Amino acid sequence: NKQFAVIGLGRFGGSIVKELHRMGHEVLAVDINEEKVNAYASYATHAVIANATEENELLSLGIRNFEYVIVAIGANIQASTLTTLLLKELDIPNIWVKAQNYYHHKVLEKIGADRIIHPEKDMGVKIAQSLSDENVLNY
Amino acid sequence: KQFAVIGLGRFGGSIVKELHRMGHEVLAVDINEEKVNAYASYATHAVIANATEENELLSLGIRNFEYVIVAIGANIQASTLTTLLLKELDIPNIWVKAQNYYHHKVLEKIGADRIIHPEKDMGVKIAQSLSDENV
Amino acid sequence: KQFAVIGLGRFGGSIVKELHRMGHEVLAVDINEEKVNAYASYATHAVIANATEENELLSLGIRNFEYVIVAIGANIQASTLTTLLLKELDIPNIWVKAQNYYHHKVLEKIGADRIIHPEKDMGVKIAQSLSDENV
Amino acid sequence: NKQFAVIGLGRFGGSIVKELHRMGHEVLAVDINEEKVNAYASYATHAVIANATEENELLSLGIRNFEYVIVAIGANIQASTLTTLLLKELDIPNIWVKAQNYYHHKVLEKIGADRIIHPEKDMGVKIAQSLSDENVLNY
Amino acid sequence: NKQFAVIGLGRFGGSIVKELHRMGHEVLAVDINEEKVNAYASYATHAVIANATEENELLSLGIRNFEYVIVAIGANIQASTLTTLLLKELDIPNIWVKAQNYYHHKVLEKIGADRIIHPEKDMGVKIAQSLSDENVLNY
Amino acid sequence: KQFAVIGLGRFGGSIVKELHRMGHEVLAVDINEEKVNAYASYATHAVIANATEENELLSLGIRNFEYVIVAIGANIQASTLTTLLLKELDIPNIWVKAQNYYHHKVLEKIGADRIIHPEKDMGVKIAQSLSDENV
Amino acid sequence: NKQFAVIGLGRFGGSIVKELHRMGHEVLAVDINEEKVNAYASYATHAVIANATEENELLSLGIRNFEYVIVAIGANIQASTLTTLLLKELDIPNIWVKAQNYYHHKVLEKIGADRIIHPEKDMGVKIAQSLSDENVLNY
Amino acid sequence: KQFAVIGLGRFGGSIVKELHRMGHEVLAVDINEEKVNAYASYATHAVIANATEENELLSLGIRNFEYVIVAIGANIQASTLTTLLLKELDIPNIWVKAQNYYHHKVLEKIGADRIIHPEKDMGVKIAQSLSDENV
Numbered sequence A, D, E, G: 001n002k003q004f005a006v007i008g009l010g011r012f013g014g015s016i017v018k019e020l021h022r023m024g025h026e027v028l029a030v031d032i033n034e035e036k037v038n039a040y041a042s043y044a045t046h047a048v049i050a051n052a053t054e055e056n057e058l059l060s061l062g063i064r065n066f067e068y069v070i071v072a073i074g075a076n077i078q079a080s081t082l083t084t085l086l087l088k089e090l091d092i093p094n095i096w097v098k099a100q101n102y103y104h105h106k107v108l109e110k111i112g113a114d115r116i117i118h119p120e121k122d123m124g125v126k127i128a129q130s131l132s133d134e135n136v137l138n139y
Numbered sequence B, C, F, H: 001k002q003f004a005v006i007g008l009g010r011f012g013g014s015i016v017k018e019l020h021r022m023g024h025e026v027l028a029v030d031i032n033e034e035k036v037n038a039y040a041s042y043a044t045h046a047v048i049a050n051a052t053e054e055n056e057l058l059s060l061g062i063r064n065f066e067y068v069i070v071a072i073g074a075n076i077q078a079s080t081l082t083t084l085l086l087k088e089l090d091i092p093n094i095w096v097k098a099q100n101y102y103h104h105k106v107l108e109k110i111g112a113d114r115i116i117h118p119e120k121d122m123g124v125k126i127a128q129s130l131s132d133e134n135v
């Protein structure tokens, strides 16, 4: 497995790990909290305990070898920004990051994030789309 | 055809704005005037109201909507009461944002037709978006 | 004849102790072992359990009780889910301590047969106790 | 009205005020919070805004003229103890106090309270009694 | 030693323990904090670790056998009041208590304290007296 | 003969009131007007002033007092600077309330003629008061 | 005046404003706190009250017209990063920023800061240099 | 020739590292072992010690140094006592980091030969660095 890596196994991160597994994809799952890493042992090709803000730990992880790395760190803008900053130095092809708010988003754009995710807002758009389909698509 | 969104937080507001961009009419509602003002331009009608009050629900004409989205956040109790009431008004489709597991569990037994989990649901979207990189 | 008390706080524990003093058998339950131990000597049986879990509710034999008192406090969501479940098990009498107004409102629509408000109810008791000074 | 006085119009205090009114009894209702005093205007023979811990305010109230005074101050042991301390000096015939916990109860006994109320626990006993009646009294 | 007992070995309590020792008096020194009890081993006829608010511990101490008991509990009105309440039940001949403020003093009077000490204020009076002596007594 | 008290907290205020009761004149000073007002009736003169400012110290006429008591509390730095200045003005007797050990240590090297420790000093008073029970 | 602009008038920022004035340089001094802006009226060619994180306010300031802009925002990494982010978009020739710590520094590098200042550490080097001069330069 | 730095925070540590890079010997001292370990490799000697204690100051041989930099931070009282003591030991040059205005004022009267204000001093450096852009 060297295509998908998810850092931060909260509701958002853990959910992509699981869905990837369900779809038969191998995934590197990482978190600083062991209780979180263990909760995703059955869904990860490899579940490691590591501080994503530490360079050496990012090398002991081989994160440089992944095409897509999702930073799903939650209510910790600093760990989130620091992490995306490091792996952007490792010139990772695709770095996706969950943003906490407008400020976070603003630094993430210039810091290296290729895609920025706002769960709340983004799901609101998809829900709007589903509602529209109920009617329009005569669904 | 009717769409009503109760609770104009990031999630609720975003669906109101989307429905508007997609040229759909939408009743936006929230107990906080400041929240209502924020999305007044996107809704065919933006009303201040406590979705917990049956009287405020009837003068709202909510009973006449096909789809009502309860997007209350931290106020779990209000989210639960609100859905209980909409169910009493027999709304055809009631979609509710679940704050957590216990919330989902009561919502399921209460009459929510669809329960939305933004973080979890978005995570599945991203996993699927991640696969499509090689479609 | 059967009595079961879920949630052994000041209120719930006090009813367990009273039932015992009045020579009645009672099933005492709480998710916290320390709470259960505190009233073990007063209950015919004191069990650790999360009243939210259907599995833990069935192995508890709660379905066989005539009266079940849900005395969950601050955890409003657990109080609500618990009562929803007991209602599914068709308990004959389900009495619930209400934490606040919204709580009372959902409990009423959920199937609680009696809703208890300690402070308010005690206040009425005292007012009545105050009149009796001249009976 | 000079028989019942209730200090502290929370759930507990406000409830006795209301029940007394319902039963046709006149009652002096007092609270330091005006929004609380106004909420009980329709149920009190007199609803006054006053700090029960201040002696002069207790005299400007004429509290010395009541046979029963209920101290229903809530999560403020100090205001509660201080208040019962003062009116005990005013040698009030009956002083009833809502206690917050065991400690509060302990000082209240020696400080002058004639009756001490523990809503939570006390209601638990009455509920136990009602349950017993459902069966025993064949009710 | 069964004449003096000091509960609460802070600056105030520890200081009376020490001065008593200096004057050749035996003293029972008690505190809930072991690091405090050990700091006064060399000055106490007996230095015990105990929660003064617990009755049994007050009996395991034999506090009932002392003519004077000083409650020198500091910034903990509750532990202070509770403690003086208990030993007043043990009908101790003299109970002296350091008060934190006016409120504390007010409960202490009715609760059983024979003497109440306000270090700050009281020392202010003695300092005033010393100043007066510098001049008046031609000292 | 002159007495001046800087810092009208419990300690400082109490000495001002005592000196007054003992028919002595006293200059009471504090940076906080509310503190000064509290002891205005006990002092021959109650002045608002920042004892740290040399200008405010000279217009105060502090230099003309025989005894100046610095009773500053939590503001250790102000207590220290104030005493440094009074020493520059060569006040005959400067008595300072020490907040803690480090404070006492600098006060001793700074020129405080007497350093007062309320809690400790009162404790010795009580021990001595305790012995006198059998005098 | 259109050469130097200082945002954040704390000890650090206010000090450069003053020194610039002393040297006869015109300077734009800005702060969100009016009490801070007024404290530097006598030293600034223009002292304005403005939120540096707001774009429009940065345009109402004409900040785009300055060769050097110092961001001296203190204990507010977010306002600091956000501000340097904006003026970097305004393509300001030289943006100097006081960093709070290593993390701040890390984002500042990639975000656009041309020079990053760490007062504490940096002064430590100059003090070391002065000590060395006392001896080495036989000074 | 002798250099001693007391207080190895950002400021103090930085001067120790600089002196080392400039090939100078330096005695680094701090009450916290973790702080001392951090700069052990940069100092000719790194010692754990409470600069407030005269005994620990003498066994430190501080009296034999030409320049002693007191870089204590938040602990203003320790900074003040420490400098008072070094002055008693007649250190030739005592440089002290001032935490604030009151601190500077006592340090000046206490015997500090140089008082350093990092933020303010750096600000003047930057203003001067800003002018030099056109030298």
Ligand SMILES: NC(=O)C1=CN([C@@H]2O[C@H](COP(=O)(O)OP(=O)(O)OC[C@H]3O[C@@H](n4cnc5c(N)ncnc54)[C@H](O)[C@@H]3O)[C@@H](O)[C@H]2O)C=CC1
Binding pocket: A007, A008, A009, A010, A011, A012, A013, A030, A031, A032, A033, A036, A050, A051, A052, A053, A072, A073, A074, A075, A076, A079, B119
């Ligand atoms: N966590 C909390 O205490 C609270 C969270 N919330 C809300 O909960 C919502 C959902 O949260 P979730 O998605 O469940 O979790 P989350 O938002 O906390 O996800 C962060 C995950 O990343 C991991 N992580 C943090 N720093 C890391 C680092 N340096 N390296 C590697 N992993 C690291 C954490 O251990 C954690 O599992 C959020 O939107 C938030 O607003 C609300 C209140 C409190």
Ligand SMILES: NC(=O)C1=CN([C@@H]2O[C@H](COP(=O)(O)OP(=O)(O)OC[C@H]3O[C@@H](n4cnc5c(N)ncnc54)[C@H](O)[C@@H]3O)[C@@H](O)[C@H]2O)C=CC1
Binding pocket: A120, B006, B007, B008, B009, B010, B011, B029, B030, B031, B032, B035, B049, B050, B051, B052, B071, B072, B073, B074, B075, B078, B079
């Ligand atoms: N609000 C705050 O101060 C803080 C919030 N957070 C986190 O931010 C997260 C995201 O918050 P959002 O979803 O944007 O806000 P939200 O969760 O409050 O959004 C729900 C919306 O429903 C409205 N509402 C509530 N009860 C209602 C009723 N009875 N009738 C009608 N409308 C009603 C609210 O006014 C609000 O605008 C939260 O889940 C929380 O954990 C973290 C720190 C502080």
Ligand SMILES: NC(=O)C1=CN([C@@H]2O[C@H](COP(=O)(O)OP(=O)(O)OC[C@H]3O[C@@H](n4cnc5c(N)ncnc54)[C@H](O)[C@@H]3O)[C@@H](O)[C@H]2O)C=CC1
Binding pocket: C006, C007, C008, C009, C010, C011, C029, C030, C031, C032, C035, C049, C050, C051, C052, C071, C072, C073, C074, C075, C078, C079, D120
């Ligand atoms: N607990 C605390 O630290 C504090 C509580 N308070 C106040 O004290 C008041 C009185 O508290 P109490 O009524 O004595 O306690 P409580 O409200 O917690 O009592 C409810 C009991 O139900 C149990 N319970 C909760 N969820 C359960 C579940 N799913 N299944 C089974 N049992 C479950 C709890 O363990 C608890 O013993 C509260 O209303 C609160 O506002 C104030 C400050 C702190």
Ligand SMILES: NC(=O)C1=CN([C@@H]2O[C@H](COP(=O)(O)OP(=O)(O)OC[C@H]3O[C@@H](n4cnc5c(N)ncnc54)[C@H](O)[C@@H]3O)[C@@H](O)[C@H]2O)C=CC1
Binding pocket: C119, D007, D008, D009, D010, D011, D012, D013, D030, D031, D032, D033, D036, D050, D051, D052, D053, D072, D073, D074, D075, D076, D079
């Ligand atoms: N008030 C709060 O912020 C919280 C209360 N709770 C719980 O809520 C429960 C029920 O509370 P309630 O009965 O509704 O109210 P309460 O317990 O606050 O009642 C106190 C009432 O007395 C009044 N009062 C206070 N000091 C007074 C004085 N010196 N003189 C005259 N009146 C004075 C207050 O304004 C208030 O209306 C309590 O058992 C408590 O554990 C739990 C969390 C927070």
Ligand SMILES: NC(=O)C1=CN([C@@H]2O[C@H](COP(=O)(O)OP(=O)(O)OC[C@H]3O[C@@H](n4cnc5c(N)ncnc54)[C@H](O)[C@@H]3O)[C@@H](O)[C@H]2O)C=CC1
Binding pocket: E007, E008, E009, E010, E011, E012, E013, E030, E031, E032, E033, E036, E050, E051, E052, E053, E072, E073, E074, E075, E076, E079, F119
């Ligand atoms: N302790 C603190 O964190 C702070 C104290 N202060 C001030 O410091 C001043 C002087 O304080 P001190 O006299 O040194 O100490 P103190 O005021 O804390 O003395 C209390 C002593 O009694 C002991 N104690 C507490 N509960 C007890 C119990 N139930 N049974 C037996 N012993 C018990 C404590 O362990 C402690 O040694 C006070 O006037 C206070 O205003 C100011 C800020 C913080």
Ligand SMILES: NC(=O)C1=CN([C@@H]2O[C@H](COP(=O)(O)OP(=O)(O)OC[C@H]3O[C@@H](n4cnc5c(N)ncnc54)[C@H](O)[C@@H]3O)[C@@H](O)[C@H]2O)C=CC1
Binding pocket: E120, F006, F007, F008, F009, F010, F011, F029, F030, F031, F032, F035, F049, F050, F051, F052, F071, F072, F073, F074, F075, F078, F079
């Ligand atoms: N003030 C508060 O909010 C709290 C205080 N405490 C404790 O209460 C204890 C007792 O406090 P007190 O001795 O009554 O008050 P205090 O220690 O503040 O009294 C010193 C007096 O000196 C005055 N003063 C300060 N700097 C001055 C200057 N430069 N020139 C002239 N006057 C100046 C102050 O305004 C004050 O009235 C304190 O030691 C503290 O630990 C505990 C909690 C809160």
Ligand SMILES: NC(=O)C1=CN([C@@H]2O[C@H](COP(=O)(O)OP(=O)(O)OC[C@H]3O[C@@H](n4cnc5c(N)ncnc54)[C@H](O)[C@@H]3O)[C@@H](O)[C@H]2O)C=CC1
Binding pocket: G007, G008, G009, G010, G011, G012, G013, G030, G031, G032, G033, G036, G050, G051, G052, G053, G072, G073, G074, G075, G076, G079, H119
């Ligand atoms: N400010 C505080 O409450 C505390 C500061 N400190 C320390 O004090 C040291 C020195 O602080 P100073 O240099 O005096 O001040 P500072 O570090 O607070 O400087 C920030 C200045 O920038 C201004 N500012 C903040 N956000 C702004 C925005 N969006 N747009 C424009 N201006 C904005 C502020 O009003 C303030 O005057 C710091 O290194 C800090 O560690 C320590 C404890 C508390």
Ligand SMILES: NC(=O)C1=CN([C@@H]2O[C@H](COP(=O)(O)OP(=O)(O)OC[C@H]3O[C@@H](n4cnc5c(N)ncnc54)[C@H](O)[C@@H]3O)[C@@H](O)[C@H]2O)C=CC1
Binding pocket: G120, H006, H007, H008, H009, H010, H011, H029, H030, H031, H032, H035, H049, H050, H051, H052, H071, H072, H073, H074, H075, H078, H079
């Ligand atoms: N330490 C903390 O948890 C926090 C600090 N800050 C701010 O960070 C700023 C910068 O801190 P720094 O300068 O890096 O640290 P600092 O101000 O603590 O550095 C002084 C050094 O002197 C040492 N020291 C203190 N008393 C001593 C004595 N008697 N003998 C010998 N050594 C002694 C200390 O151990 C420390 O390493 C502070 O001014 C503070 O306002 C802000 C938040 C938290």
